[PDB]
Amino acid sequence: PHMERASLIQKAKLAEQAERYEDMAAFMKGAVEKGEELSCEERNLLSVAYKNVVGGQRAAWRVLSSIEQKSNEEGSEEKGPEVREYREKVETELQGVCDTVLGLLDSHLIKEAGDAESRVFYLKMKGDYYRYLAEVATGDDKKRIIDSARSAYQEAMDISAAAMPPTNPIRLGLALNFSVFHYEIANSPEEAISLAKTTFDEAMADLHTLSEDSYKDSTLIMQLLRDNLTLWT
Amino acid sequence: HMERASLIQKAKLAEQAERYEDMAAFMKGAVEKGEELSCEERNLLSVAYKNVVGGQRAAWRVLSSIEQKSNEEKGPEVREYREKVETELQGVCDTVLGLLDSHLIKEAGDAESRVFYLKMKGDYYRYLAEVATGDDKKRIIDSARSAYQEAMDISAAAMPPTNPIRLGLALNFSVFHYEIANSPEEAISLAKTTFDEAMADLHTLSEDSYKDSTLIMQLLRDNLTLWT
Amino acid sequence: RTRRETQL
Amino acid sequence: RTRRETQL
């Protein structure tokens, strides 16, 4: 059972070259279920795979939801059922994918996480895929999901603050996604801007100290922080 | 009754959301209702499955190039995954060819739809021939040539040489000769004749028909530049 | 685009 | 551009 794991990672890399991300996610899901820890490469293969899968489902959900808003505004009555049924089917597929990711995180990855870097990576994923569920959630389920995302995000913020430099791309991307959580989901634009401001400010103070190979990843996320701040202010 | 309209409506929604596998399923259900497809519904069905099989073909070519490099010392993994993608592609082509032979080609009212459906039959047999190997390959190539030729005969007797359906048919047929049938002189001969005869009657076209004909004529001319 | 940014 | 062209 420890000779199949190498084949699953091999087929995940092949699926990535072939842009077959649903197969890639299935291959990475099987690799995680083997029980061994993931390296930095294997962590990204798992994250890249599922982000593309849920990313296309989110884009489809947003398209169908905007059409549903217009169809319940304009006066289209017979158009209503087709859009509602199809948007709900895409909504179910998206929720099913997030449950798979959150299932792998809580049952394998987050528990047996060796270093702080991986634990922040996995906890950031847990907050991300709870945030994706909150994007489509409605009532009783929604309010509990928003609390679960904040708990996962906050635990990663505390670990990264004590274990990572403010220029670390994982800490930056974590705060970037957390600020979006505050703005979009938690309805806290002042906390969203404050977190984005502080994240940019503290990373800006230490920009001259950055390492050579960290330049490209860190300055990219700082641009995203500035882009959202430009949009929110 | 009026569920057929809902299937076509959801296909348009899937197209807006770029959910082409969903779009194909909706159009498959619309065809299975038994009624004929309009010009719009003909393109919705074709666009859906062309996108679906198009990504499977691109994935197959990536895995096949990797398999060729791996055979010059790794394991079975590349072959196994390439065969799985090969199976999904064959399933999609078998579904399209199933809809054509059992619904569309039979209940074809005009020449435009009949040439369109026969061109589809040749196209998706050609996609099968791209992955076929031995015994299947020659049997599949014969089915594509027959489907292409039957569309060539109908288009020759019922369509002007500038007709975009006739042009696109000859474009894919010339590619069939070059890649699959191993007849590069017949491929070039077909592409030249199609380009020349369409060129002769370009002055008779209207503004809205001119743009569609010259678009395919450039593709014919592009392949000729590549093949000669 | 006109949308806010997030990343892996 | 480096590949041959087929229509729908």
Short mmCIF file of C-alpha atoms in Angstrom, two decimals:
data_model
loop_
_atom_site.label_atom_id
_atom_site.label_comp_id
_atom_site.label_asym_id
_atom_site.label_seq_id
_atom_site.Cartn_x
_atom_site.Cartn_y
_atom_site.Cartn_z
CA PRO A 1 0.00 0.00 0.00
CA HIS A 2 3.04 2.32 0.04
CA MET A 3 3.87 1.70 -3.65
CA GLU A 4 0.53 2.97 -4.95
CA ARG A 5 1.09 6.36 -3.27
CA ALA A 6 3.97 7.17 -5.63
CA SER A 7 1.80 6.33 -8.65
CA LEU A 8 -1.01 8.61 -7.44
CA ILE A 9 1.33 11.61 -7.23
CA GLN A 10 2.75 10.73 -10.65
CA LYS A 11 -0.71 10.72 -12.24
CA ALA A 12 -1.58 13.98 -10.48
CA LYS A 13 1.38 15.68 -12.16
CA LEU A 14 0.30 14.21 -15.50
CA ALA A 15 -3.28 15.40 -14.97
CA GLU A 16 -1.92 18.88 -14.23
CA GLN A 17 -0.01 18.92 -17.53
CA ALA A 18 -3.21 17.77 -19.25
CA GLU A 19 -5.28 20.32 -17.26
CA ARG A 20 -7.50 17.52 -15.90
CA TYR A 21 -7.98 19.03 -12.46
CA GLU A 22 -10.93 16.86 -11.41
CA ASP A 23 -8.76 13.81 -12.07
CA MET A 24 -5.83 15.62 -10.44
CA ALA A 25 -7.93 16.25 -7.32
CA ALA A 26 -9.03 12.60 -7.28
CA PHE A 27 -5.39 11.50 -7.56
CA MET A 28 -4.32 13.85 -4.76
CA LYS A 29 -7.26 12.77 -2.60
CA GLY A 30 -6.07 9.17 -2.90
CA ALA A 31 -2.50 10.21 -2.11
CA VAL A 32 -3.57 11.98 1.10
CA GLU A 33 -5.70 9.01 2.19
CA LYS A 34 -2.53 6.87 2.18
CA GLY A 35 -1.79 8.42 5.59
CA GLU A 36 1.63 9.96 4.93
CA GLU A 37 2.40 13.66 5.27
CA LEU A 38 2.52 15.90 2.21
CA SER A 39 5.62 17.84 1.21
CA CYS A 40 5.55 21.43 -0.03
CA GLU A 41 5.19 20.13 -3.59
CA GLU A 42 2.46 17.64 -2.65
CA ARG A 43 0.69 20.34 -0.63
CA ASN A 44 0.50 22.58 -3.71
CA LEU A 45 -0.60 19.74 -6.00
CA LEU A 46 -3.53 19.10 -3.65
CA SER A 47 -4.41 22.79 -3.35
CA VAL A 48 -3.98 23.68 -7.04
CA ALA A 49 -6.14 20.72 -8.07
CA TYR A 50 -9.15 21.53 -5.90
CA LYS A 51 -8.88 25.30 -6.38
CA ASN A 52 -9.33 24.89 -10.14
CA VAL A 53 -12.26 22.50 -9.65
CA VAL A 54 -14.13 24.67 -7.16
CA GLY A 55 -12.96 27.79 -9.00
CA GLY A 56 -14.83 26.82 -12.14
CA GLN A 57 -17.88 25.84 -10.11
CA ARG A 58 -17.86 29.19 -8.29
CA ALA A 59 -17.62 31.10 -11.58
CA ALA A 60 -20.55 29.08 -12.93
CA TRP A 61 -22.54 29.68 -9.74
CA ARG A 62 -21.97 33.44 -9.98
CA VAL A 63 -23.14 33.48 -13.62
CA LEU A 64 -26.31 31.51 -12.86
CA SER A 65 -27.05 33.57 -9.74
CA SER A 66 -26.83 36.88 -11.62
CA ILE A 67 -29.20 35.49 -14.25
CA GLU A 68 -31.55 34.31 -11.50
CA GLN A 69 -31.59 37.80 -9.97
CA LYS A 70 -32.54 39.35 -13.31
CA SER A 71 -35.12 36.66 -14.06
CA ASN A 72 -36.84 37.33 -10.73
CA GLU A 73 -36.63 41.09 -11.45
CA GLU A 74 -37.51 41.44 -15.14
CA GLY A 75 -40.73 39.43 -15.14
CA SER A 76 -39.62 36.08 -16.54
CA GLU A 77 -41.88 33.48 -14.89
CA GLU A 78 -41.26 30.35 -16.98
CA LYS A 79 -37.52 31.12 -17.07
CA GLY A 80 -37.51 30.93 -13.25
CA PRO A 81 -37.66 27.15 -12.78
CA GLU A 82 -34.91 26.27 -15.28
CA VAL A 83 -32.48 28.77 -13.72
CA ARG A 84 -33.34 27.87 -10.12
CA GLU A 85 -33.00 24.13 -10.79
CA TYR A 86 -29.71 24.43 -12.68
CA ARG A 87 -28.17 26.90 -10.22
CA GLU A 88 -29.13 24.58 -7.36
CA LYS A 89 -27.52 21.61 -9.12
CA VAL A 90 -24.27 23.55 -9.56
CA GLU A 91 -24.64 24.74 -5.96
CA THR A 92 -24.83 21.11 -4.84
CA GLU A 93 -21.73 20.07 -6.79
CA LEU A 94 -19.78 22.98 -5.27
CA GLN A 95 -20.90 22.06 -1.75
CA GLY A 96 -19.98 18.44 -2.40
CA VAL A 97 -16.44 19.40 -3.42
CA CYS A 98 -15.94 21.63 -0.37
CA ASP A 99 -17.11 18.83 1.92
CA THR A 100 -14.47 16.58 0.35
CA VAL A 101 -11.69 19.14 0.91
CA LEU A 102 -12.79 19.91 4.47
CA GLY A 103 -13.06 16.16 5.05
CA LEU A 104 -9.45 15.55 4.03
CA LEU A 105 -8.29 18.49 6.16
CA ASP A 106 -10.00 17.48 9.40
CA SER A 107 -9.34 13.73 9.09
CA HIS A 108 -5.76 13.60 7.76
CA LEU A 109 -3.86 16.80 7.04
CA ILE A 110 -4.44 19.24 9.92
CA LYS A 111 -3.96 16.56 12.59
CA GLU A 112 -0.59 15.13 11.48
CA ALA A 113 1.00 18.42 10.44
CA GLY A 114 4.69 18.45 11.34
CA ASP A 115 5.87 22.05 11.05
CA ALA A 116 4.19 25.42 11.47
CA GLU A 117 4.37 26.18 7.74
CA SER A 118 2.18 23.20 6.80
CA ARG A 119 -0.23 23.80 9.70
CA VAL A 120 -0.80 27.39 8.56
CA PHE A 121 -1.21 26.17 4.97
CA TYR A 122 -3.86 23.60 5.92
CA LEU A 123 -5.71 25.91 8.32
CA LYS A 124 -5.80 28.58 5.61
CA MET A 125 -7.38 26.00 3.28
CA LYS A 126 -9.99 25.14 5.92
CA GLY A 127 -10.95 28.80 6.20
CA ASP A 128 -10.98 29.15 2.41
CA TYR A 129 -13.32 26.22 1.72
CA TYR A 130 -15.61 27.20 4.59
CA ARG A 131 -15.69 30.67 3.04
CA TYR A 132 -16.64 29.11 -0.30
CA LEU A 133 -19.52 27.31 1.43
CA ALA A 134 -20.63 30.59 3.02
CA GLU A 135 -20.76 32.18 -0.44
CA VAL A 136 -23.68 29.87 -1.32
CA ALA A 137 -25.10 29.17 2.16
CA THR A 138 -28.37 30.81 3.20
CA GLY A 139 -29.72 30.69 6.74
CA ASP A 140 -29.11 28.44 9.74
CA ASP A 141 -26.23 26.64 8.03
CA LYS A 142 -24.63 29.91 6.91
CA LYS A 143 -24.25 31.44 10.38
CA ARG A 144 -22.43 28.37 11.72
CA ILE A 145 -20.21 28.19 8.62
CA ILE A 146 -19.05 31.80 9.01
CA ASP A 147 -17.99 30.97 12.57
CA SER A 148 -16.08 27.89 11.39
CA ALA A 149 -14.16 29.91 8.79
CA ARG A 150 -13.19 32.59 11.31
CA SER A 151 -11.96 29.93 13.75
CA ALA A 152 -9.79 28.26 11.11
CA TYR A 153 -8.52 31.62 9.81
CA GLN A 154 -7.79 33.00 13.28
CA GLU A 155 -5.85 29.91 14.39
CA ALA A 156 -3.64 30.25 11.32
CA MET A 157 -3.16 33.97 11.98
CA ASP A 158 -1.95 33.27 15.52
CA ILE A 159 0.52 30.59 14.41
CA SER A 160 1.88 32.67 11.52
CA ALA A 161 2.27 35.78 13.69
CA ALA A 162 4.55 33.96 16.15
CA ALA A 163 6.31 31.64 13.67
CA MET A 164 6.62 33.49 10.35
CA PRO A 165 8.16 36.76 9.18
CA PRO A 166 5.65 39.36 7.93
CA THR A 167 7.01 38.88 4.39
CA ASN A 168 6.25 35.14 4.31
CA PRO A 169 3.97 34.54 1.28
CA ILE A 170 1.82 32.07 3.22
CA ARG A 171 1.23 34.60 6.00
CA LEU A 172 0.49 37.30 3.41
CA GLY A 173 -1.92 35.17 1.38
CA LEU A 174 -3.59 34.06 4.61
CA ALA A 175 -4.24 37.66 5.67
CA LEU A 176 -5.34 38.55 2.13
CA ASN A 177 -8.01 35.83 2.14
CA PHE A 178 -8.95 36.61 5.75
CA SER A 179 -9.50 40.28 4.91
CA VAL A 180 -11.76 39.22 2.03
CA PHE A 181 -13.60 37.01 4.53
CA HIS A 182 -14.16 40.06 6.74
CA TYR A 183 -15.31 42.22 3.82
CA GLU A 184 -17.53 39.81 1.88
CA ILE A 185 -18.71 37.19 4.37
CA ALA A 186 -18.46 38.64 7.88
CA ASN A 187 -19.69 42.07 6.68
CA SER A 188 -16.82 43.79 8.53
CA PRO A 189 -15.28 46.23 6.03
CA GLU A 190 -13.43 48.13 8.77
CA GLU A 191 -11.75 44.94 9.99
CA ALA A 192 -11.09 43.92 6.38
CA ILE A 193 -9.35 47.20 5.56
CA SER A 194 -7.53 47.26 8.92
CA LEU A 195 -6.19 43.74 8.39
CA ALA A 196 -5.19 44.54 4.81
CA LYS A 197 -3.58 47.80 5.95
CA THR A 198 -1.67 46.16 8.80
CA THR A 199 -0.62 43.23 6.61
CA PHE A 200 0.70 45.60 3.95
CA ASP A 201 2.26 47.96 6.54
CA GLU A 202 4.15 45.26 8.49
CA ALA A 203 5.27 43.54 5.29
CA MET A 204 6.28 46.92 3.83
CA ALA A 205 8.55 47.70 6.78
CA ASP A 206 10.51 44.49 6.14
CA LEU A 207 10.50 44.58 2.32
CA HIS A 208 14.20 45.40 2.00
CA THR A 209 15.00 42.34 4.16
CA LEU A 210 13.18 39.89 1.85
CA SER A 211 15.02 36.93 0.38
CA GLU A 212 15.86 36.76 -3.31
CA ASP A 213 13.62 33.82 -4.24
CA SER A 214 10.77 35.18 -2.09
CA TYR A 215 10.59 38.46 -4.07
CA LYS A 216 8.26 37.20 -6.80
CA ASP A 217 5.70 35.55 -4.52
CA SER A 218 5.63 38.22 -1.80
CA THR A 219 5.42 41.33 -4.00
CA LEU A 220 2.59 39.67 -5.92
CA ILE A 221 0.42 39.28 -2.82
CA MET A 222 1.23 42.81 -1.64
CA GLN A 223 -0.14 44.04 -4.98
CA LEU A 224 -3.34 42.08 -4.32
CA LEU A 225 -3.56 43.66 -0.86
CA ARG A 226 -3.18 47.10 -2.45
CA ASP A 227 -5.71 46.23 -5.16
CA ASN A 228 -8.39 45.28 -2.63
CA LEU A 229 -7.57 48.34 -0.51
CA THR A 230 -7.95 50.47 -3.64
CA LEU A 231 -11.31 48.78 -4.29
CA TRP A 232 -12.57 48.98 -0.69
CA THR A 233 -11.50 52.58 0.04
CA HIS B 1 -44.51 18.26 -23.96
CA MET B 2 -42.94 21.53 -22.85
CA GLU B 3 -39.95 20.02 -21.07
CA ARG B 4 -38.06 20.14 -24.38
CA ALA B 5 -38.00 23.93 -24.17
CA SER B 6 -36.54 23.69 -20.66
CA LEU B 7 -33.71 21.42 -21.86
CA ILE B 8 -32.71 23.90 -24.57
CA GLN B 9 -33.01 26.79 -22.12
CA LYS B 10 -30.70 25.07 -19.63
CA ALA B 11 -28.26 24.32 -22.45
CA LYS B 12 -28.01 28.06 -23.14
CA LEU B 13 -27.41 28.66 -19.43
CA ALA B 14 -24.68 26.01 -19.39
CA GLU B 15 -23.09 27.75 -22.38
CA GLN B 16 -23.11 31.10 -20.57
CA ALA B 17 -21.51 29.39 -17.55
CA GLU B 18 -19.04 27.46 -19.77
CA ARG B 19 -20.40 24.16 -18.43
CA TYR B 20 -20.11 22.33 -21.73
CA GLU B 21 -20.53 18.81 -20.34
CA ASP B 22 -23.82 19.96 -18.80
CA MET B 23 -24.67 21.69 -22.09
CA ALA B 24 -24.15 18.45 -24.03
CA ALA B 25 -26.37 16.50 -21.62
CA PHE B 26 -29.14 19.08 -22.03
CA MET B 27 -28.86 18.96 -25.83
CA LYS B 28 -28.73 15.15 -25.74
CA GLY B 29 -32.02 15.19 -23.84
CA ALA B 30 -33.47 17.65 -26.34
CA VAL B 31 -32.51 15.42 -29.28
CA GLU B 32 -33.86 12.32 -27.51
CA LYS B 33 -37.27 14.04 -27.39
CA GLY B 34 -37.60 13.10 -31.07
CA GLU B 35 -38.24 16.51 -32.63
CA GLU B 36 -36.04 18.06 -35.30
CA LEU B 37 -33.45 20.69 -34.38
CA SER B 38 -33.40 24.20 -35.81
CA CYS B 39 -30.25 25.93 -37.07
CA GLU B 40 -29.71 27.37 -33.59
CA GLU B 41 -30.32 24.02 -31.89
CA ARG B 42 -27.99 22.32 -34.40
CA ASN B 43 -25.13 24.60 -33.34
CA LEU B 44 -25.91 24.27 -29.62
CA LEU B 45 -25.58 20.49 -29.90
CA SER B 46 -22.38 20.71 -31.96
CA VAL B 47 -20.72 23.43 -29.85
CA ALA B 48 -21.38 21.45 -26.66
CA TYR B 49 -19.83 18.17 -27.77
CA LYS B 50 -17.01 19.82 -29.72
CA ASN B 51 -15.86 21.54 -26.52
CA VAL B 52 -16.20 18.31 -24.50
CA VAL B 53 -14.29 16.10 -26.94
CA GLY B 54 -11.90 18.98 -27.69
CA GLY B 55 -10.52 19.00 -24.16
CA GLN B 56 -10.29 15.20 -24.16
CA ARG B 57 -8.32 15.26 -27.42
CA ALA B 58 -5.93 17.90 -26.06
CA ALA B 59 -5.44 15.86 -22.89
CA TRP B 60 -4.89 12.69 -24.92
CA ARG B 61 -2.20 14.38 -27.03
CA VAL B 62 -0.40 15.63 -23.90
CA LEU B 63 -0.44 12.17 -22.31
CA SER B 64 0.56 10.53 -25.61
CA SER B 65 3.61 12.77 -26.05
CA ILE B 66 4.62 12.01 -22.45
CA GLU B 67 4.10 8.29 -23.10
CA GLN B 68 6.38 8.45 -26.14
CA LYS B 69 9.13 10.07 -24.07
CA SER B 70 8.63 7.58 -21.22
CA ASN B 71 9.06 4.64 -23.63
CA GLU B 72 12.62 5.70 -24.51
CA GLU B 73 12.56 3.88 -17.79
CA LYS B 74 9.43 4.61 -15.77
CA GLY B 75 6.33 2.53 -15.05
CA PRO B 76 2.79 1.85 -16.27
CA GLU B 77 1.33 5.05 -14.77
CA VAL B 78 1.47 7.11 -17.96
CA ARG B 79 -0.08 4.38 -20.11
CA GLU B 80 -2.83 3.65 -17.58
CA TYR B 81 -3.96 7.27 -17.31
CA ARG B 82 -3.74 7.80 -21.08
CA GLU B 83 -6.00 4.77 -21.57
CA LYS B 84 -8.55 6.13 -19.08
CA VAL B 85 -8.76 9.46 -20.93
CA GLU B 86 -8.93 7.45 -24.16
CA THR B 87 -12.00 5.63 -22.81
CA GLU B 88 -13.84 8.83 -21.88
CA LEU B 89 -13.13 10.25 -25.34
CA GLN B 90 -14.47 7.09 -27.00
CA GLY B 91 -17.57 7.25 -24.81
CA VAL B 92 -18.27 10.82 -25.91
CA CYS B 93 -17.77 9.96 -29.59
CA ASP B 94 -19.97 6.87 -29.22
CA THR B 95 -22.68 9.07 -27.67
CA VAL B 96 -22.52 11.61 -30.52
CA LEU B 97 -22.46 8.96 -33.25
CA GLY B 98 -25.32 7.24 -31.42
CA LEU B 99 -27.48 10.36 -31.54
CA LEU B 100 -26.66 10.91 -35.22
CA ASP B 101 -27.51 7.43 -36.51
CA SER B 102 -30.61 6.96 -34.34
CA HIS B 103 -32.23 10.42 -34.49
CA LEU B 104 -30.58 13.22 -36.44
CA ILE B 105 -29.38 11.87 -39.81
CA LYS B 106 -32.60 9.90 -40.34
CA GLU B 107 -35.00 12.73 -39.47
CA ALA B 108 -33.16 15.36 -41.52
CA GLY B 109 -35.52 17.67 -43.39
CA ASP B 110 -33.33 19.84 -45.62
CA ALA B 111 -29.93 19.45 -47.24
CA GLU B 112 -28.31 21.91 -44.82
CA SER B 113 -29.11 19.78 -41.78
CA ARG B 114 -28.34 16.53 -43.62
CA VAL B 115 -24.87 17.73 -44.67
CA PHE B 116 -24.30 19.12 -41.17
CA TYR B 117 -25.14 15.81 -39.48
CA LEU B 118 -23.14 13.71 -41.96
CA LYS B 119 -20.18 16.05 -41.43
CA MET B 120 -20.51 15.45 -37.68
CA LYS B 121 -20.53 11.70 -38.30
CA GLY B 122 -17.28 11.99 -40.23
CA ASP B 123 -15.76 14.30 -37.62
CA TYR B 124 -16.41 12.07 -34.60
CA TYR B 125 -15.33 8.96 -36.49
CA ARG B 126 -12.15 10.88 -37.28
CA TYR B 127 -11.71 11.61 -33.57
CA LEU B 128 -12.00 7.87 -32.91
CA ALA B 129 -9.45 7.15 -35.65
CA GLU B 130 -7.00 9.50 -33.91
CA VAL B 131 -6.79 7.02 -31.02
CA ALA B 132 -7.59 3.75 -32.82
CA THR B 133 -4.77 1.30 -33.39
CA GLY B 134 -5.17 -1.79 -35.49
CA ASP B 135 -8.29 -3.68 -36.45
CA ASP B 136 -10.56 -0.83 -35.32
CA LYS B 137 -8.55 1.86 -37.13
CA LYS B 138 -9.18 0.77 -40.72
CA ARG B 139 -12.80 -0.07 -39.93
CA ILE B 140 -13.29 3.36 -38.32
CA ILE B 141 -11.55 5.23 -41.16
CA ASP B 142 -13.95 3.64 -43.66
CA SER B 143 -16.94 4.88 -41.65
CA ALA B 144 -15.54 8.43 -41.63
CA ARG B 145 -14.84 8.39 -45.38
CA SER B 146 -18.37 7.16 -46.11
CA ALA B 147 -19.95 9.81 -43.87
CA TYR B 148 -17.77 12.56 -45.36
CA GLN B 149 -18.40 11.41 -48.93
CA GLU B 150 -22.18 11.22 -48.49
CA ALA B 151 -22.11 14.80 -47.23
CA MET B 152 -19.88 15.77 -50.16
CA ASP B 153 -22.40 14.32 -52.63
CA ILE B 154 -25.39 16.09 -51.07
CA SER B 155 -23.54 19.41 -50.76
CA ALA B 156 -22.31 19.13 -54.36
CA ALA B 157 -25.86 18.76 -55.71
CA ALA B 158 -27.70 21.07 -53.29
CA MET B 159 -25.28 23.79 -52.17
CA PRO B 160 -23.23 26.56 -53.77
CA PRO B 161 -19.43 26.19 -53.50
CA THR B 162 -19.39 29.23 -51.16
CA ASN B 163 -21.76 27.62 -48.64
CA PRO B 164 -20.01 27.63 -45.23
CA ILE B 165 -21.31 24.14 -44.44
CA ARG B 166 -19.84 22.80 -47.69
CA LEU B 167 -16.61 24.72 -47.06
CA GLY B 168 -16.20 23.50 -43.49
CA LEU B 169 -17.01 19.97 -44.66
CA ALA B 170 -14.23 20.05 -47.26
CA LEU B 171 -11.86 21.64 -44.73
CA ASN B 172 -12.31 18.77 -42.28
CA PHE B 173 -12.31 16.22 -45.12
CA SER B 174 -8.97 17.50 -46.43
CA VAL B 175 -7.55 17.25 -42.90
CA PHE B 176 -8.94 13.71 -42.79
CA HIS B 177 -7.02 12.88 -45.97
CA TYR B 178 -3.78 14.43 -44.69
CA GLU B 179 -3.70 13.11 -41.11
CA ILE B 180 -5.82 9.96 -41.11
CA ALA B 181 -6.13 8.62 -44.67
CA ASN B 182 -2.42 9.28 -45.44
CA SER B 183 -3.37 10.94 -48.76
CA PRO B 184 -1.58 14.31 -48.77
CA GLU B 185 -2.02 14.83 -52.52
CA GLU B 186 -5.75 14.18 -52.21
CA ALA B 187 -5.83 16.48 -49.17
CA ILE B 188 -4.15 19.31 -51.10
CA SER B 189 -6.23 18.61 -54.23
CA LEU B 190 -9.46 18.87 -52.22
CA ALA B 191 -8.33 22.04 -50.44
CA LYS B 192 -7.27 23.76 -53.68
CA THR B 193 -10.45 22.82 -55.55
CA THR B 194 -12.62 23.92 -52.63
CA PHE B 195 -10.74 27.22 -52.33
CA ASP B 196 -10.71 27.91 -56.08
CA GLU B 197 -14.37 27.10 -56.77
CA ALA B 198 -15.45 29.17 -53.76
CA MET B 199 -13.18 31.99 -54.94
CA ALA B 200 -14.86 32.10 -58.36
CA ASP B 201 -18.32 32.82 -56.91
CA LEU B 202 -17.30 35.26 -54.16
CA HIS B 203 -18.65 38.30 -56.04
CA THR B 204 -22.23 36.99 -55.89
CA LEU B 205 -22.30 36.88 -52.08
CA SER B 206 -24.08 39.32 -49.78
CA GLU B 207 -22.30 41.24 -47.02
CA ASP B 208 -23.57 38.92 -44.26
CA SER B 209 -22.70 35.78 -46.26
CA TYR B 210 -19.35 37.08 -47.53
CA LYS B 211 -17.69 37.15 -44.08
CA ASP B 212 -18.61 33.54 -43.26
CA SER B 213 -17.31 32.10 -46.54
CA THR B 214 -13.97 33.94 -46.55
CA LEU B 215 -13.36 32.87 -42.94
CA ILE B 216 -13.25 29.19 -43.90
CA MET B 217 -11.39 29.96 -47.14
CA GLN B 218 -8.55 31.39 -45.04
CA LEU B 219 -8.44 28.18 -42.99
CA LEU B 220 -8.30 26.14 -46.20
CA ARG B 221 -5.47 28.42 -47.40
CA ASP B 222 -3.73 28.13 -44.02
CA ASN B 223 -3.59 24.33 -44.21
CA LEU B 224 -2.32 24.51 -47.81
CA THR B 225 0.51 26.79 -46.65
CA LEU B 226 1.34 24.25 -43.93
CA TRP B 227 1.05 21.19 -46.20
CA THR B 228 3.01 22.54 -49.18
CA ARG C 1 -10.93 42.83 -13.23
CA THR C 2 -13.58 44.61 -11.16
CA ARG C 3 -13.51 41.78 -8.58
CA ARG C 4 -11.50 41.49 -5.37
CA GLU C 5 -8.44 39.25 -5.28
CA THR C 6 -7.68 36.01 -3.38
CA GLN C 7 -4.93 33.41 -3.90
CA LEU C 8 -3.93 29.78 -2.94
CA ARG D 1 -1.08 28.42 -35.44
CA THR D 2 1.37 25.52 -35.48
CA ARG D 3 -1.52 23.05 -35.83
CA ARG D 4 -3.78 22.39 -38.79
CA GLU D 5 -7.26 23.91 -38.73
CA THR D 6 -10.63 22.13 -38.52
CA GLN D 7 -14.10 23.69 -38.50
CA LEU D 8 -17.38 22.91 -36.71
#
